Amino acid sequence: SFMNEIDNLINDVENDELEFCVAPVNVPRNFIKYAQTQNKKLF
Amino acid sequence: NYLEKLNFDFKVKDVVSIRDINLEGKEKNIETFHDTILLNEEKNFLKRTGLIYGSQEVYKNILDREIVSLSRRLPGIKSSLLSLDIVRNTIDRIDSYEYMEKIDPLEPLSEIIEKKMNI
Amino acid sequence: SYDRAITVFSPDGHLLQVEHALEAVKKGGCAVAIKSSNFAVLAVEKKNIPKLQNPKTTEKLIKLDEHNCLAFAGLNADARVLVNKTRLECQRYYLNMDEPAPVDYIAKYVAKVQQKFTHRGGVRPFGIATLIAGFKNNKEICIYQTEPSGIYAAWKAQAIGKNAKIVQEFLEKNYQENMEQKDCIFLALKAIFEVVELSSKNVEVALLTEKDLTFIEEQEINSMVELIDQERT
Amino acid sequence: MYDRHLTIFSPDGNLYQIEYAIKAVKNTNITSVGVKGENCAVIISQKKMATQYISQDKLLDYNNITNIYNITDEIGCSMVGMPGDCLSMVYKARSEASEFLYSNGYNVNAETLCRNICDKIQVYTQHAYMRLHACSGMIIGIDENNKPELFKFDPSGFCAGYRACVIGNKEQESISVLERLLEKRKKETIDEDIRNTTILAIEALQTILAFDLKASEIEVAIVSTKNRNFTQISEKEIDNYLTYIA
Amino acid sequence: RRYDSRTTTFSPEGRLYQVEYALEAINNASITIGLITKDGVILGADKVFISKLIDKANNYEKIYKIDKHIFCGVAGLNADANILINQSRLYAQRYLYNYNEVQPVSQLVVQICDIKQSYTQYGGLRPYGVSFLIGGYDTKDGYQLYHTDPSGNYSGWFATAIGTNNLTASSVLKQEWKNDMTLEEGLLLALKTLAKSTDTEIPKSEKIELAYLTNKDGEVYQKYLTEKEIEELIKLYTQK
Amino acid sequence: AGYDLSVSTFSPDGRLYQVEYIYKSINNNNTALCLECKDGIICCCINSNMDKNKMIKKNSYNRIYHVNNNIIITYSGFDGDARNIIDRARSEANTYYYNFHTNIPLHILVNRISLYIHAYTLYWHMRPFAASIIISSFNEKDKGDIYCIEPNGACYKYSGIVIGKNKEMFKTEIEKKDYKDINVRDAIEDIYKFILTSDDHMNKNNLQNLVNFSWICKESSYEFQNIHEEILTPALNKAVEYIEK
Amino acid sequence: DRGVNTFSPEGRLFQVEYALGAIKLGSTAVGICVNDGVILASERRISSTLIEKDSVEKLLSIDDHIGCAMSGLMADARTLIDYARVECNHYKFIYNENINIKSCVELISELALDFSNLIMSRPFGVALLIGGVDKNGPCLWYTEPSGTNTRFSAASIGSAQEGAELLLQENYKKDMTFEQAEILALTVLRQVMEDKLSTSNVEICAIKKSDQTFYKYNTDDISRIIDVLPS
Amino acid sequence: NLYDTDNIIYSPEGRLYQVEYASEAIKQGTCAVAIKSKDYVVVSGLKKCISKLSFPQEKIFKIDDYIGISMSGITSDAKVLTKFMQNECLSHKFLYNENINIESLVRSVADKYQKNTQKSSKRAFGVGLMIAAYHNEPCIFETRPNGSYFEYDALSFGARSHASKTYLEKNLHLFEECSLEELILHCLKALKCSLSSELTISNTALAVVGKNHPWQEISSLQLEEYLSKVKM
Amino acid sequence: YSFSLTTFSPTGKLVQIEYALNRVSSSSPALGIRAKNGVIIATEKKSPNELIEENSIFKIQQISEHIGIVYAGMPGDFRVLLKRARKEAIRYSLQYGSEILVKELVKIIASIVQEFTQTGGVRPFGLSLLICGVDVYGYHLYQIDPSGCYFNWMATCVGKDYQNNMSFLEKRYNKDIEIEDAIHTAILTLKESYEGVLNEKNIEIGVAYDNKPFKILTQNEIKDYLI
Amino acid sequence: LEYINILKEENGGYNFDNLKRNEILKEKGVKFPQFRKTGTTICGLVCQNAVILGADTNCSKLHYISKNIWCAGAGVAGDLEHTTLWLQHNVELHRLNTNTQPRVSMCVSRLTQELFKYQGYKVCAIVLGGVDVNGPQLYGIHPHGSSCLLPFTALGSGSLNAMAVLEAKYRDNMTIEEGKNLVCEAICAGIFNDLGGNVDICVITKDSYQHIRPYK
């Protein structure tokens, strides 16, 4: 509801399968590449 | 989550525009900061008002701003939006978004009405 | 109004707005279309003021794409807007396929759009009944005919506009299969002139072949209308 | 039809929604007088509940009943009208004062606040989407030049300067009466003019409303150069002024 | 809801109601004439007498310039005409900005018709009560002139009129008009049809205004007539 | 007569007929007493229209809620609008302690709720709120305070207020004696006598099923708590014995 | 006069009742949900001899294992079938197993009833008859515009459906084999056809239990099942 | 007469009309009855059948373990509400890993009722539901079209609701502290009285929930046994 | 729910705006003369209560260094139009670094007024603005109506009895007139239709000179010109 | 918040078309022409009831905010020019709307918010000062947005010598002529010491100011 939206706005307290999530990093397009610098077991 | 939502739309390549390099990730650069230059300021203002005075003030402000903004011309010819300037109290102020200009190309007027208000 | 159902169901299960669109279509000008073998002649009624009006600007047998073509009756501005939409959609489809747009897809798209304007808030029905002519991916000539209600159906020889029923009955009585080009153009001219005054200036017939939409010259039209006038007596 | 319902110009002008709002303000019959002196500005009202469906009762703290409010610290106000609309306009004036103080870096002026509220009421009048606020304010303030300023607006949005005015029922003839009192002022230390303006305002309310006005039915406030802060004068001092006048 | 005007709504039989009333406003304005000549495109207009104190010099409220090679004239509400001419200027200049060429007039009248059709069909706002007479020159098809309306329809016209007494102006144009007509003959025909529509024998110089677009030396040049040349044209008209 | 069909539209003689329609609706709905005492406060809710409905569980339908375990809020109008306003009060207290860490003062809460209820009585498409809400609290130093926002958005400070059916009779009954000196423990008997006498539907048997209570006084350390049935039952017996004689 | 969502005095939505008034006007269609499968048929109401009779088909395939019949407003019904097959193939994308008939008719119902704000403006004046096979056998379904979807043993839709449903009630029996279902459907059709039952004046689609494929019967099959009818 | 055009207009007596028409729509629905005890709440009810060829329209929908409800009105509103409480229960058991409070769910759906009846361009739900559960005690709830939720010991919706209400009020004291079989027998007798038309396996919708027994519709054999028991 | 309340009536005429013109017919006079050495605007400000501060109730306002403005209507629309006109003037100033020409500002205000007449769910304005100014192209005096049409006037009057006032002005107006004669004609025209005794504080006079900034004449200057 | 999206779409602002092309060009390794760094010696001081700014050029550094507010910039020429034009016109619009004398505090607050919104990207140092109702006030704005009411300020490349001279030879209740002499003793000395042009002096009185571009 609009009430909960404004309440979350003032309080500063803020998912379908086919939607694709991305990192909040500065450049998400290279994010995986940055992660490939950290490790390679996951990738 | 992000990046719109696939729905088997089948119309991925248009004859009006091409996809951006970032699609909709919206990587933080100077244009991204300048895009959210007015939304953040009014978020701060609504935070101040509905905090100190009560969230009903923010409710009244948002409904008044939407009502006066709803009173505007159709997409195409630019709308003066004087009543919005009175309500948001920016008529006294002249700012970078008032002056300067962007010249704007391939979309017919009917596609703009479909895109603006979902018809 | 914005977000307001302009068209709504009546007490007797009818959309009165779509009905008003239907008699608006019927009050428009006539247009005839025939198909045979691998081509489809197309004709529209022309109405211009002599000595003042420019016949060149008044165009009715537009071409939508490389192959498909569209005629219309009723509101001209609505036809122009839907023509812009359909041309943009044809280029979208030809971008994704890299193959020409078949008549069936664009006919279904026109039906979908005309249904959408009869089911969305803040949009009135399109006051036209366009009929598309062109070749499918199989490369066989076919003609479809949409209406403001969004109903579409394949046709072999169909007409629209004022006094449409008389032309439909005449075509149903007289139409043959696998006709020649001259025979098709003669039948189209006779069909439109059954409900139009016999004159050369009131027809702009053109023949659609796989190469293009070739507009018939004025001398041929003059010879055919004189022949029809002779045959009438 | 529906010309008088929405804010529509109607035949031969006379926007009628504004007149109905003004009449609704008049029906509350809470007379409130404002007077401007010299280095002082007294605002006086009546501690009475607005006329409406409910009625006053003995089990009611009468001190809580009030029509005079503070915008920020120096500029006061007095709305007479509907209960919710009055305090909503008070909060809107507070929001405009907060806007001015945050942006321009100094306290808002009474004139600028009055013009801003007039513009907002103008947006309310022109747009038929929202109901008009039936509450006419009466703003006072000390300017940067250390001079008093009296101001008033209406649901029409007519912000204008004043020296002595009144809001509520029977506001027509009272325009003469205050002028006669200014005639008495036409013919001194800071406290002298403060006392003179206070007793003149009390006498104006006594002549207009035409009854004794006991000490538990008056709210008096003054902004002067000696203090400059909007403060309500106590009950005992109001009783002293009432006894001195009689 | 109960206060809805219901603009974008068909009539009982076949028509948009407000679009008719808009057309009636076009039937209740000062007459505007449009012509095609062998050396230009003439478009006169009749000035409504608001008062004698109107500044006659440089107050051409009927004919306006949309671009260096396009002009137009109105026969309806001037306030709508100002905004619509502004949008026409914006589209023409944006076409010159993007494609680096002078706007063909057919595209411009198509776009202003799209504006008027969007107000006709989309939303609930009232339609645009003004009809234009856009005309100009381009290398595609030489000289051209068009006639837009609030319904969005448009078509070419070798000679046409709009406004009050448009039938009389059309009748006058039907008889006296030729393809191989010089600019002076077209101007005299404009004077004759304007006088016939106004019902006066001698046209009044202050009550009319004229303009044309010559394409001499391979360069478009619009000239708007002032009082002295109008008086000279009227004097030559009465003497022939 | 046209002007009465919308809350936004003004009547010709300056009185919004829709607002008095709210007043009539609330006046024809469940009553709600509340008053102040020396020890504390006491608010009572009586559900008379439920007398026909002999299906409700024992004392399950409670109209008296609380905020922060410090403030009592009750009502008399429709249930849904009141619950929305209650959740708004909870949200306001939430935001207040989030962004300032101090419990919300009561005048802040009643002022914000008053402007919130008024914030729906100046538009055209939202249904106006039909609820007259009574907020109350008690502190040892500050004695007691009981506010009451009307549906118009009119907040006044009351020592005691009654809203709903027979509100005039109940307010007459409360004014018979000064209740500032009467303790909270003893006022339950007088409240029982008033609801049994003033209200015709409430018989002897219905006093325990369709009545609600809560105090804020020194016995519960100045905090929310409902009356235990062992306290209500002797008061009920004494009231029935007195009224029977 | 009134909005798209306004209750009548009898607690019935006016627009829903008007939508139910429009579904009666349409072409006849009949279906039998026998144990072997569904035999969803239609009329092929020919407007004129010039109709090509290839683009005008009432029986459409929501999926390979689903069949349906349309009635009432036709473009609206095409929109319903398009959304139904879109979400059916979406279900095939997320989940490996083919979509059940029940879930498909729920998607159709929540498409039909989204016109109330609870975007689309007015109700969908269509009365579909969905039928198909899933892991628990054949299933035949129905969705009037009011959204009260309900499964049927055998059903009929379109104009003059009263005689069709009465005859189906008077002839249908349990444990009926697939050929018996075919001849029953053709007899019901011929006893509600105004004209004669020719080979080209009828469309039938079958979703068999073993095959689980949308097989629209060709001219020869239609001719055979017409020939095997009784007197 | 004139004030019923929209759901934001009160009569001169201060009363809605669209909400009352939604209540009448609930009254037009079929019958359903539920009775609790000490640790068992039965939820039975009829099942609408348009024609002999049509099998009955299923009424009962299970929202979560120890949570199931019965519709007595418009089917689409019932579907939307069932989906919403299903999502709420699954989200609560997902994020917090515990069963949701029945009071919280009832208040949330009644809140949605409030939002959808408040604003214009909207209609209140034409359905009432028995939000029954065994959140550590048997409970039966009821949310009306107006924003409000109530709690009872027994309940009936529409059709011949007067007969069921009379029987339940007459035999209200035997219902508390009784065996499961006796509770089933009493509830089926109440449904038989509602019929005043006879109970069968197809149209009857007996369902049992309580201690060591999540929501599960009873099989055909036991249902036939109970309908034989009530018959004799 | 956005629809236009200003809708074309039968027989056209755009009736809603005509009601606004009736308000312009019911407002106090506000005239102005374009002189050979400047431009003048004058108005009749009332004394409704006799306790009003004459300075506070401005009607002849200043937008730019050589642009004045006066109106005849309700005051709030004048205030918001003045504020937006000033904002457009500074917008031109930052865009181009020069004083805004009178024609451009008149066109912008006409577009805004027509916008509000055409926009859904908002009534038209209730005043007839009267722009004046001086620029490199000489003197200018325009008049934006509620309908949005702008007229390049030379000497005009709007308010109560505007026809008689315009006739009186036309009877005693010439193209070549000094600033003093123009001011005297303005005072005479205002005194012609007053229905009372004209004196100090009842009128306000603004003048923009050939080179000086637009100055509003003080009360002493108005009294001196009265004699 | 859909109305703010409408406001963004209708109104203009900072277009950002050629970010990617510039990224490719700078990554490819070519030197591009430099900015006009007009940062020179500027100073100001709070004299007897009048501010006295100072600067040096033929770029006139002394810019006009109001009839009683002048300022001097040091940094990038375009940023200083546009920000000064914006501040002058904002104050002019406020003066027209509110009808009051301009105040230095309002200018300081507006400049502080504008420069704080852009953290360090706008190279913009201003020594704005003037006379208002609260007397003369001089301020020391920095490119990070940190104002400070100092009795005298000296910014620029050669600010050290000017600041040292001002600290040596500053006194309260100073004469205007002595203020001008001290202004040259700062600016002229900084010009001849630091690595030009003509000095600039302008006394900021409450009314009737005067500008001296050919000061020395």
Show the tokens assigned to A42.
């996951």
The whole-angstrom distance between residue J104's C-alpha and the CA centroid of its chain comes to: 13
Q: What is the DSSP letter of B21?
A: S
Contact of E187 with E33, CB cutoff 8 Å:
no
Contact of E134 with E108, CB cutoff 8 Å:
yes
Contact of G214 with G207, CB cutoff 8 Å:
yes
Residue of chain I nearest B74, judged by CA positions: I119
What's the CATH number for G4-226?
Answer: 3.60.20.10
Length of chain A (residues): 43
Q: What is the DSSP letter of G51?
A: B
Residue of chain F nearest A10, judged by CA positions: F95
Residues 6+ apart with CB under 8 A from F92: B54, B55, F104, F108, F109, F112, F113
- Residue for token pair 């000489």: I138
Angle (nearest 5°) at CA G106 between G101 and G107? 100
Find the helix or strand (DSSP H, E) in which G170 lies. Answer: helix G161-171
Residues 6+ apart with CB under 8 A from G226: G186, G197, G199, G202
Give the separation between CA H165 and CA H157, rounded to whole angstroms.
9
Count of CA atoms in the C-beta half-sphere (13 A) of J55:
26
The residue among H18, E1, H119 whose CA lies nearest residue G117 is H119
* Boundaries of every domain in chain D: 1-246
Asked if C2 reaches chain I (Cβ–Cβ under 8 Å), the answer is yes
Which domains does chain F possess? 1-239 (3.60.20.10)
Which domains does chain E possess? 1-239 (3.60.20.10)
The residue among D42, D38, D30, D79 whose CA lies nearest residue D230 is D42
The answer to whether J175 is a known catalytic residue is no
Query: Which of chain I's residues have a Cβ under 8 Å away from the Cβ of E51?
Result: 156, 166, 170
> Could you tell me whether strands G137-140 and G154-157 are parallel, antiparallel, or unpaired per DSSP bridges?
unpaired
Size of the C and E interface in Cβ pairs below 8 Å: 93
The backbone region for F66, taken as left when phi is positive above 0, alpha when psi lies in -120 to 50, beta otherwise, is beta
Give the separation between CA E190 and CA E32, rounded to whole angstroms.
10
Query: Which of chain H's residues have a Cβ under 8 Å away from the Cβ of F130?
Result: 10, 14
User: Which experimental approach was used here?
Assistant: cryo-EM
First vs last Cα of chain I: how many Å apart?
Answer: 59
Is I119 in contact with B71 (Cβ distance < 8 A)?
A: yes
Contact of B118 with G119, CB cutoff 8 Å:
yes
Is J133 in contact with D105 (Cβ distance < 8 A)?
A: no
Q: What is the DSSP letter of E153?
A: -
Q: How far is CA C9 from CA C14, G13, G157, in A?
A: 6, 12, 20
Closest Cβ opposite residue E24 in set I5, I12, I119: I12
Count of CA atoms in the C-beta half-sphere (13 A) of C61:
27
B71: closest CA of chain I, how far (Å): 6
Asked whether at least 3 C-beta pairs link D and A within 8 Å, the reply is no
Show the tokens assigned to I145.
């109506």
Contact of I105 with I131, CB cutoff 8 Å:
yes
Give the number of domains in chain I.
1
Breaks (C-N over 2.5 A) in chain B follow: 104
The whole-angstrom distance between residue I85's C-alpha and the CA centroid of its chain comes to: 13
Show the tokens assigned to G222.
């239609």
Quickly list DSSP for H135-179: SSSEEEEEE-SSS-EEEESEEE-SSSHHHHHHHHHHTHHHHSS--
Which amino acid, one-letter code, is at J201? I
* Strand spans (E) along J112-187: 124-126, 129-132, 135-138, 152-155
Give the separation between CA H27 and CA H36, rounded to whole angstroms.
23
Contact of B50 with A6, CB cutoff 8 Å:
yes
CB-CB neighbours of C140 under 10 Å? 12
Partners for H (CB, 8 Å, 3+ pairs)?
Answer: F, G
The residue among J161, I119, J116 whose CA lies nearest residue E126 is I119
The residue among I219, I148, I221 whose CA lies nearest residue I179 is I221
Give the separation between CA D23 and CA F217, rounded to whole angstroms.
46
Give the separation between CA D66 and CA D46, rounded to whole angstroms.
8
Show the tokens assigned to E84.
């619509």
Is C151 in contact with G125 (Cβ distance < 8 A)?
A: no
Closest Cβ opposite residue A11 in set F87, F88, F95: F95
Residues 6+ apart with CB under 8 A from G153: G32, G33, G140, G172, H53, H54, H55
Query: Which of chain B's residues have a Cβ under 8 Å away from the Cβ of I121?
Result: 70-71
Residue I9, Cβ density class (10 Å: 0-12 exposed, 13-18 middle, ≥19 buried): middle
Q: What is the DSSP letter of F51?
A: G
Give the separation between CA E7 and CA C116, rounded to whole angstroms.
19
Is B86 in contact with D123 (Cβ distance < 8 A)?
A: yes
Asked if E148 reaches chain C (Cβ–Cβ under 8 Å), the answer is no
Give the separation between CA B92 and CA D47, rounded to whole angstroms.
38
Give the separation between CA I53 and CA I55, rounded to whole angstroms.
5
Largest CA distance in chain H: 56
Give the separation between CA D224 and CA D193, rounded to whole angstroms.
10
The residue among B67, J17, G8 whose CA lies nearest residue H28 is G8
Which domains does chain C possess? 16-232 (3.60.20.10)
Asked whether at least 3 C-beta pairs link A and I within 8 Å, the reply is no
**3 state DSSP class of I209:** strand
Q: What is the DSSP letter of J118?
A: S
Residues facing E42 on adjacent strands: E212
**3 state DSSP class of F144:** strand
In F, residues 65-124, which contact A (CB 8 Å cutoff)? 87-88, 91, 94-95, 98-99
Residues facing D222 on adjacent strands: D42, D231
Count of CA atoms in the C-beta half-sphere (13 A) of J86:
19
Give the separation between CA G208 and CA G203, rounded to whole angstroms.
16
Give the separation between CA J52 and CA J92, rounded to whole angstroms.
22
Give the torsion sign (CA, E90, E95, E97, E101). Answer: negative
State the catalytic residue, choosing from J38, J40, J84, J153.
J40
Angle (nearest 5°) at CA B75 between B69 and B78? 75
Query: Which of chain H's residues have a Cβ under 8 Å away from the Cβ of G11?
Result: 21-28, 126
Query: Which of chain B's residues have a Cβ under 8 Å away from the Cβ of E114?
Result: 108-110
The residue among H63, H73, H71, H57 whose CA lies nearest residue H21 is H73
Which amino acid, one-letter code, is at I52? I
Give the separation between CA F202 and CA E107, rounded to whole angstroms.
82
Contact of E132 with E148, CB cutoff 8 Å:
yes
The whole-angstrom distance between residue G218's C-alpha and the CA centroid of its chain comes to: 19
In E, residues 160-179, which contact B (CB 8 Å cutoff)? none
The residue among D63, D66, D77, D75 whose CA lies nearest residue D235 is D63
Give the torsion sign (CA, H205, H208, H209, H215). Answer: negative
Q: What is the DSSP letter of F39?
A: S
Asked whether at least 3 C-beta pairs link J and H within 8 Å, the reply is no
Alpha helices in chain I (DSSP H): 15-25, 75-96, 102-118, 162-171, 179-192, 219-226
The residue among H140, H193, H129 whose CA lies nearest residue H165 is H193
Give the separation between CA G85 and CA E96, rounded to whole angstroms.
47
Contact of F57 with H151, CB cutoff 8 Å:
yes
Give the separation between CA I142 and CA F102, rounded to whole angstroms.
60
Give the separation between CA I196 and CA F1, rounded to whole angstroms.
43
Count of CA atoms in the C-beta half-sphere (13 A) of C180:
3
Give the separation between CA J49 and CA J133, rounded to whole angstroms.
11
Query: Which of chain B's residues have a Cβ under 8 Å away from the Cβ of G93?
Result: 8
**3 state DSSP class of B10:** coil
Asked if G159 reaches chain C (Cβ–Cβ under 8 Å), the answer is no
Is B63 in contact with F115 (Cβ distance < 8 A)?
A: no
D4: closest CA of chain B, how far (Å): 21
Is B55 in contact with F123 (Cβ distance < 8 A)?
A: no
Give the separation between CA F5 and CA J119, rounded to whole angstroms.
55
Contact of I74 with D156, CB cutoff 8 Å:
yes
Residue range(s) defining the domain that contains residue I120: 5-227
Which domains does chain H possess? 1-231 (3.60.20.10)
Yes or no: domain D1-246 corresponds to CATH 3.60.20.10: yes
The whole-angstrom distance between residue J208's C-alpha and the CA centroid of its chain comes to: 21
Show the tokens assigned to G100.
């059940």
CATH number of the CATH domain containing I130: 3.60.20.10
Contact of C154 with G56, CB cutoff 8 Å:
yes
Give the separation between CA I148 and CA E77, rounded to whole angstroms.
9
Give the separation between CA C75 and CA C129, rounded to whole angstroms.
10
The whole-angstrom distance between residue H65's C-alpha and the CA centroid of its chain comes to: 16
Show the tokens assigned to D24.
């609704």
Query: Which of chain D's residues have a Cβ under 8 Å away from the Cβ of I76?
Result: 118-119, 121-122, 125, 156-158
Give the torsion sign (CA, F176, F180, F181, F186). Answer: positive
**3 state DSSP class of F180:** coil
Give the torsion sign (CA, F195, F197, F203, F207). Answer: positive
Give the separation between CA I123 and CA I76, rounded to whole angstroms.
14
Which pairs from D65-71 meet CB under 8 Å and 24+ separation? Answer: D65/F156, D66/D219, D67/D30, D67/D32, D67/D219, D68/D32, D68/D43, D68/D219, D68/D221, D68/D232, D70/D230, D71/D97, D71/D108, D71/D113, D71/D139
In H, residues 151-190, which contact G (CB 8 Å cutoff)? none
Asked if D107 reaches chain J (Cβ–Cβ under 8 Å), the answer is no
H162: closest CA of chain F, how far (Å): 12
Residues 6+ apart with CB under 8 A from D208: D31, D33, D166, D170, D174, D177
